[PDB]
Amino acid sequence: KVKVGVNGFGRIGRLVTRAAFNSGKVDIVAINDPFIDLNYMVYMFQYDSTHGKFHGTVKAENGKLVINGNPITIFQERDPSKIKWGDAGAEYVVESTGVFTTMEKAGAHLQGGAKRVIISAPSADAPMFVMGVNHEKYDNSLKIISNASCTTNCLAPLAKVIHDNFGIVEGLMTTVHAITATQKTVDGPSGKLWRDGRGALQNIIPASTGAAKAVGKVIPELNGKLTGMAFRVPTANVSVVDLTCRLEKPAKYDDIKKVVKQASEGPLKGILGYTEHQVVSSDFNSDTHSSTFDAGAGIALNDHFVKLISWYDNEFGYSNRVVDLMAHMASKE
Amino acid sequence: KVKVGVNGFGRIGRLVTRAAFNSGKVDIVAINDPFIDLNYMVYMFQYDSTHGKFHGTVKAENGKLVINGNPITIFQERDPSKIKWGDAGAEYVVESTGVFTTMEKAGAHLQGGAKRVIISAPSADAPMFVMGVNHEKYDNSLKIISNASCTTNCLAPLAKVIHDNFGIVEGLMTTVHAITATQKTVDGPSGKLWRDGRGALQNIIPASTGAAKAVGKVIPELNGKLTGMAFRVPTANVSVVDLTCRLEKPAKYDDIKKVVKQASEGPLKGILGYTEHQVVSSDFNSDTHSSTFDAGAGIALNDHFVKLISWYDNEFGYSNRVVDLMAHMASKE
Amino acid sequence: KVKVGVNGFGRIGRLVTRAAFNSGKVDIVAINDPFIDLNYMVYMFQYDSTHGKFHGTVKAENGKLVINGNPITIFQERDPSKIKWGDAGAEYVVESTGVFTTMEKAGAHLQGGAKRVIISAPSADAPMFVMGVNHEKYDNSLKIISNASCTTNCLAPLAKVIHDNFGIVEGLMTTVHAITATQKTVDGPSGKLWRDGRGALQNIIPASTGAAKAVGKVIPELNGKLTGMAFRVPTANVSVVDLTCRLEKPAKYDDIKKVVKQASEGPLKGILGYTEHQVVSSDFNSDTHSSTFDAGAGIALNDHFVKLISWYDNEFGYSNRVVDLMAHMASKE
Amino acid sequence: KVKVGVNGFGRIGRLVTRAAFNSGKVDIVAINDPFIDLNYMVYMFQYDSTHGKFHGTVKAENGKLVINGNPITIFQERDPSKIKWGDAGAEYVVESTGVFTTMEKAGAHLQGGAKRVIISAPSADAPMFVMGVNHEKYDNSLKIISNASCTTNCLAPLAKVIHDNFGIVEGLMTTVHAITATQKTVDGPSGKLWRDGRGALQNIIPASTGAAKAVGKVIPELNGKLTGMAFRVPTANVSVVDLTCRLEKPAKYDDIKKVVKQASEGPLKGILGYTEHQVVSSDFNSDTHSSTFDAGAGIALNDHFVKLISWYDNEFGYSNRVVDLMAHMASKE
Numbered sequence A, B, C, D: 001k002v003k004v005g006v007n008g009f010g011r012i013g014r015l016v017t018r019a020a021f022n023s024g025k026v027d028i029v030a031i032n033d034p035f036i037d038l039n040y041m042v043y044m045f046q047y048d049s050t051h052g053k054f055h056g057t058v059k060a061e062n063g064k065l066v067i068n069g070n071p072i073t074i075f076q077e078r079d080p081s082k083i084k085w086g087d088a089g090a091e092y093v094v095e096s097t098g099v100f101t102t103m104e105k106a107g108a109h110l111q112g113g114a115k116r117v118i119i120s121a122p123s124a125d126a127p128m129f130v131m132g133v134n135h136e137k138y139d140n141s142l143k144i145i146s147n148a149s150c151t152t153n154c155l156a157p158l159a160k161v162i163h164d165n166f167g168i169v170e171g172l173m174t175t176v177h178a179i180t181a182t183q184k185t186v187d188g189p190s191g192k193l194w195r196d197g198r199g200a201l202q203n204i205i206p207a208s209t210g211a212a213k214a215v216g217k218v219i220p221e222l223n224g225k226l227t228g229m230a231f232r233v234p235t236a237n238v239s240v241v242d243l244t245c246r247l248e249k250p251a252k253y254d255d256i257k258k259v260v261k262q263a264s265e266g267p268l269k270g271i272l273g274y275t276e277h278q279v280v281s282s283d284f285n286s287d288t289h290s291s292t293f294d295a296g297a298g299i300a301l302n303d304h305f306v307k308l309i310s311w312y313d314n315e316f317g318y319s320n321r322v323v324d325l326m327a328h329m330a331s332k333e
């Protein structure tokens, strides 16, 4: 129903576009990317190494990108304040470039005639939302908004269920993470973060992340009670969260499984998944959940100290939540 | 000095053999493998995808394996009771097939005339040792010994230092582990461990391990205080330990750093390393340490709750610790 | 309509089974595998790293494997002679273990009451068929038959169109091939084929193949005019043929492209594909074509000396041809 | 003896530097790179994922890079016309950025006081050389020179031996090539070459190359008689040439082995290699040959039509030829 514009046609930009057409929950009417012209967009959207060929039509017709017969207006504007969102009829804009994450920069989209702006990344100052955790706190007064990180959309729905039930005294998270566009194929320059320059095919690579800490802004009761870090490993897609956490109320592993499977079939349905199957990462390729709890993989030392494992397609899970949020925003207009 | 026989020319057999000649600490004089003919042994020892071409000479000469000029006796004996280790003059036998890990099956090497057996794997009942942790607890009465698991040999020297200075109340360990010979190139049969059957190039694979619980047996104070699990990731070699633990005494991160660094210079030198460098996994390929503490990669929630990172070359570190163990058993005969 | 048994639930067995239900061209009524129980068959069939989760339903129910509501008799017989194919109504048996490839060993399925046997591998003596090339030479006298290799099914349809139109004086093929179930994760034992034991993730591995020479059996006019070799490379699936051939009659690259495009739209449709798109290997993952000509990747030196590139999903292409071969066999009884 | 400056501290710039210090054939006195400051250089040079950690000493000392006690002056200029090579005393400049490969752009180094420039890539107009093939046609008049490409350096020495002895009438070349710094970790923008945009870990990627044709410039007799293409595969390093050629004089395979072994032992020593071992790509990691002919991997259809296989470390071999070419240039001053 709501008409959407996407700034940036990267993995997130294209996969949000793909998720909008598959779910039908929003309508993509404009795309802006200064480094990908229209024919190149046809090709980049049609063919995907990770998620296969688009099931649908995609063609260049009279200067438009046409997907499933729906023409999309294309801008090639390096400055966000110069994108005529309002001319193209784009009410919400997905800011997915990764370089306009502050409320000051992301706000440029309001100049072109856009009413609301969703940042597809963590934000220093924009209010962060995670579907099924704190989305119901959104209101019409917020015009610039963040959907947090993929890792945050994994840990947070799991953290919520475990806090609400047994209470998290303190937790340390490791994410074993698929490679991303920011890494390099062979040892190369990554001036800010030296490890991230090292060959992504050859290396387990330790990285910093604020994704755990950030759970404290979508679940305030956990503020200052979570942090962690990442290992980038050589797979194309799908990441796993490893949450090590002390609970204050006693929790048998079967209890943890009981409450998580309850949440998965009830209000967190389609956001937090549950499985007892002998799954590996490629089993969650193109899986739309934010988080799928892996019963068999985790381990408890005692009733108050556990290791919990949850899978997430860092590409497809996150992109589907960016669509799910925009549909909630538009239901509350 | 002590004359060693190796059962099984697998990854461990060849690299134990390789580390022997490189360190000179022991003298290899026999190999038994019944699926690998002498000519094939030349090639498999000469060429290594992970550790590069053997720096030295290897040839098949008059039915022996001649490495740097030292002729080695070759057996093709499917049954260990039937290997004449004594005739060949092998004081110690390394038991590296991974199927003779119980004291009963391992003992067969004594029938052939060997006096001692080192098991290059965890054992149900054979006594386990970790260099730098309980190797002095070894005495001439023991004739069937285990050198534990490569993972235990990474976690133990770190647990020891941390527990010595701060006390470990409890810990949960994740190891992000390189692929091994037991895994498959594509989805294949692993009847008892369905996940280890899934294609190793495609998948992050969750796995059970006893390496953390095993640390209870070489540091008895830690018995019942540690467990863990592993992820298999598509890299050829080098693995990392992620120890989340609670300490009863306050430990500022700079205090954890000082003590581990101080241990690495002192009694534990060459077993536990210390680094502040921006390292990635391949920086440790063919590194002879058991455990290298990674200062920058670790993170602390607070003075009591820490996530500590240690690298290990699961192939080369472990193989050097088997050679080291046998060296120490010789210094006390 | 024709009722089919599968011997071996390996990569080919399961994907032949998957292709039978997806296409609906045959009915799988029976499977034999001595190393894979009923339960484990549910999991291996349902979850696939390469081709994703089975679209449809799979459960164990009353000792039978139930796919899309169709029950399947499960045998655990090591000896092919002793499989009661006739009691379960298996008229054709797919011999997919790759250890019963001779007409003598393959005949063993007729003992248990099967009428016809399709070896899902090349055979030393059994007549070999390629769909769209020589499958019309099949008749009812034949009971033991081979569907050739995945590589022959890629090369033969292209070779046919090139020979038909311009005449192949001679040619040499390279296949750059994805990793298979016979390779090793780390340097391991491969006594017949020393290169094939070197670690499949680390290495480009040269290999011998008879697949180019076998095109001489399905197109007798090319007997003695083709040979070739392979490189194994670290991808899970999808391979490519590289055909360097001399042409009798003069052929500009544009004429080659026309006749290949024509053949792909006409009598070789669904078997030979044709594309001018900027494709890469993963664009053919789960592509059911035997052979897809890549127009942009090929190059001519001159009107008589050219290099032609053709993609093949070595798993899913070949598996669909086995079902197509059996369906054509049912039509001619 | 000759003093050398390196423009660009990428894979080629660092490994030429590494080869200069290990062979001792030239002295690196200066390095320019605008995106990599002094302390970053110490790290990127010290630790290499492919070639291992540097064997020697490297430190930042008083604004100079000090390698094995030799201090190196570190520029940070974007416009080569403004590097003060003269003042640092760099007589030869290695132009290794990839963006200054024309005589006019590379000529900019002469304005800074350098006397000659070696382009470490193919050039549109600068004369190209391959050591062991046409390097003796260099003379003191040439101030701007190209060292051709890693692939040309592999094909040219093999093509010269085959052509000197049997006569190359026509050849088509495929190179199966390791991933490079121009590729992407996941599907990403590559506006001029769309296939090079697709995820390098997931894909066999066809590509154009002028390497086989360029052989016609260093061996004028084969001008217009060679061309080829490439496939990029997911390995970190080491590539292979696949040469399908037709000969004028008859050549049994054993005659081809004989004359290639002969040239590898005699005047092409250290440039062209020869082996009969069951080698795989990793067996050539850090191998310094231009080309190693793999006798067992190649195949003949007949005495006039053969496919020949030659391996090359596309990073280390090429880097060592750059040092060698500068050693030759210094000798003819």
Ligand SMILES: */C(=C/C(=O)OC)C(=O)O
Pocket (backbone or CB within 6 Å): C011, C012, C120, C149, C150, C151, C180, C314, C315, C318
């Ligand atoms: C072709 C190779 C392959 O990938 O097999 C699964 C074939 O098997 O027929």
